[PDB]
Amino acid sequence: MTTRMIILNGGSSAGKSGIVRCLQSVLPEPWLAFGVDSLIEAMPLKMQSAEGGIEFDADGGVSIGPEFRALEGAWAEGVVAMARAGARIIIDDVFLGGAAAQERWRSFVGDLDVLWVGVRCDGAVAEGRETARGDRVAGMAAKQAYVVHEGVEYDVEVDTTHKESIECAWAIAAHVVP
Amino acid sequence: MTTRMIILNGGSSAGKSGIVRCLQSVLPEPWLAFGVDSLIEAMPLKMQSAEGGIEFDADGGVSIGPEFRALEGAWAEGVVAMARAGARIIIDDVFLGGAAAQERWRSFVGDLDVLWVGVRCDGAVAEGRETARGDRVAGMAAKQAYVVHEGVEYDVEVDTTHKESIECAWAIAAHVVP
Amino acid sequence: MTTRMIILNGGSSAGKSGIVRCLQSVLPEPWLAFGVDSLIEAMPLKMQSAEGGIEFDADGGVSIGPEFRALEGAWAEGVVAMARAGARIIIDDVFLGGAAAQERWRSFVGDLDVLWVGVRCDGAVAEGRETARGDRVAGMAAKQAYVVHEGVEYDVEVDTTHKESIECAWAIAAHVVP
Amino acid sequence: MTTRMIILNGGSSAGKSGIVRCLQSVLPEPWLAFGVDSLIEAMPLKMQSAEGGIEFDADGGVSIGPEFRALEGAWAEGVVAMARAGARIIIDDVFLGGAAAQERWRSFVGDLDVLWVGVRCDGAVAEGRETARGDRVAGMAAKQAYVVHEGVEYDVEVDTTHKESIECAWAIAAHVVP
C-alpha cells in the first residue's frame, strides 16, 4: 500500500541527485536519501584503488570488483532494513548491469513496497552537464546514458533532457502512495 | 582587440558556474575563473557574521556592508591586474546593485578589453534549481532573477531557462576574440 | 569473537573523522564508515530547519527533536543490519545524551560484537581545532568536549590532545578482533 | 611598517590551511586568504591533465609545467596588487623549488611589506595527517616535508608537530605589524 522505498536508476549526470533533493523538499514526510555516491563515500578511500572495488578508466568506463559487490550487498540490506523499520528511503543508483542490477535489488527488497523510477537524459546533453558540473572523470555520462536502462522495468519514467528536476520530482511524488 | 576578461552577471542559480566551467573546457587558451563565491571563500569566516560584510536573511535576501565592499574593491583590482599581466580571466558575479554594480566594475576595468555577459533564467525555474542544488539559504534565486539585470548593458546574453550550460558557453565563446 | 562494529563517541572536533579514515586505511579488511554527519547529509535539508529535527543555536548548542530521533533510530537498525549481513561497520557519533545515548545504541546492537571507543580531547584544544577546520557554527567543540562521555562505558579510550589520529587509530585497531 | 601580506610556506599537510583560518579568526583586521589550492581551483579542470600545467604521479610526486607557471605568475601579480590596493593578504604556498620559489615571490612582491612564515612538521606525522584528512593522492606530505624549506628564509617559523594551529597562529600574529 504505502510506498516504503523509492529507487531511481539513471546514468551519471542524468540528474538523479537533483531530483532526489527536490523529492526530499516536496514530499511532506521526511525521506532519507542514500545512493551509490554516499556509498563510495562510506567505503575506505583505498577502495577506489583496488581489485574487488571500483576503478574508473581514462574514458569514464567503470568496473566493479567482488570486494565492492560484497560491501554494496550488505549496504543494500541495510537501507532495506531502514525502510522495514519505518523510515522512508530514497535511493539513487547506476545500474551498470542493466536488468541484472534490478534483479539484485529485487532480491534484497523482497515484498517491500518499492517505487521504481527511471531517470533518462540524452547522452550528449548529459555529457554537457558532466562538463558543467566539473566532474573529475569525463566520459561517464555518455557511456552510461542508455545501457543502464536496458531491460529495466520502471513504475515511472522521467526525462531530464527537457524537464527541470523539480518538475520530474513532481511527477515522481505523484506516484508516491502515503 | 583580444578579449582579456569575461564578466558574467546573473542571479543565484542562473547557471553562472556551470557556464564558467564549460567555458574553461571549451576555450582553447587557459582561462582562470574567479567569482563572488570564491571571494566569499577567501574572506574570513567571521565576515559572514558582521556589519560591513555579508549577511543572508531568512527569505534569501542579501546585504553587503562597507567592510565587504572594501575587500571586494581590492579583489577587483587584483583580478584586473591578473588580466593586465597576461592571464585570461573569467569572472561571474551577482550585480545586486544593477547598473551601479556594472559601473563599479567599469571603474576598475579601465580600458581593458572586456566581454560583458548576461546570464538570465526565469525566477521560478531558478528557484527550482536552487532546491535541486541543495543551496543552504532558499529564496535567493527568485529575489535576484531580474533586478540584477536592471540597467545593465551586455555584449552577449544567454538564457538558461531552455538552453544547456554547454550551449550557452558556445554562444559566449563565439564572441571571445583571440 | 570477531569484531563486527566499531562505535566511536566524542565531542565535535575531537578528531573522530580523522581517526575513522585512519582506521579504514590501517585495517586490512574493508570497513564501511557512517556517522552522525553522513546521517545529517542523508536527511532532507529542511530537517535542519524544523521541530522534531536538529537545530544549532548561536553558541554551538544542539537540540534534537522527535522527527530526527525517529529517522536516526531507523538508520541505526540499518547499519546494525549491515553488520549483521557481514559488512564491517565503523560508526562515529556524538552522545549528547551521555549514557542514555549509549543505551539507545545498546538496544539496537543487541548481541552484536561491538568495540566501544571513547575519543577525548581537551575543550580548549578542540575549540581551537574547530576554528582551524572552519566549522560553520563555533562553540560545539567546547560544549560537547566532556558531557558526551558522562556515564559512558568504553572498551578503549584515546585522547587526541597529544596523540595524532594515526596513532589513536593504531591503538584502536589493536583491540579489533579479526 | 604595516604588514601588507603574510606568506606561509610548508609541505602538504603541514597545517597551512588550518593556521590560515586561525589567522583570519585571530587577526582584528579582515585578511583575505588565497593559496595554491584556490589557484588550482580557479584553473580550468583540464589543467590537471596537461603538459604545461600540474600533474601528480602515483607516489605523490608533483610537477609543474610552463602553462601552469604562466598563470601562477599572473595570479601572483594579482594578489600583490590586491595588497597594494589596501587589502590585507594571506597566502599559503608549497615551495617545491625551495629558495628559487622564494625568489620568484620576491620578484613579484617588490618593496611590499611581507611577513615570511615557515610552517614545518615532521614527515611521518604529516603523512599520518595526510591519511587522516583523506587526501586523494597519498605521498605528498612525506615528499614535501623538508625540501620545500631548503634555502628558504623566514621571518617566523612554526612547527605543527607538537603545536596546535591556533597556537602557531598566535605566534604568527605576534609578528604582524598593524
UniProtKB/Swiss-Prot annotation, chains A, B, C, D:
Active site: D37
Keywords noted in UniProt: Antibiotic resistance, ATP-binding, Kinase, Nucleotide-binding, Transferase
Gene Ontology biological process: response to antibiotic
Top-level EC class: transferase
Pfam families for the chain: CPT
InterPro entries named among the record's database cross-references: CPT, P-loop_NTPase
Disulfide bond annotation, renumbered to this chain: none
Single Gene Ontology MF annotation: kinase activity
EC numbers, comma separated: 2.7.1.-
Positions annotated to bind ATP: G10, G11, S12, S13, A14, G15, K16, S17
Spans through the membrane: none
Free-text function comment from the UniProt entry: Inactivates chloramphenicol by catalyzing the transfer of the gamma-phosphate of ATP to the antibiotic's C-3' hydroxyl group.
Family: To M.tuberculosis Rv2636.
Subunit structure: Homodimer.
NCBIfam families on file: phos_trans_CPT
Protein name as it appears in the record: Chloramphenicol 3-O phosphotransferase
Species of provenance: Streptomyces venezuelae (strain ATCC 10712 / CBS 650.69 / DSM 40230 / JCM 4526 / NBRC 13096 / PD 04745)
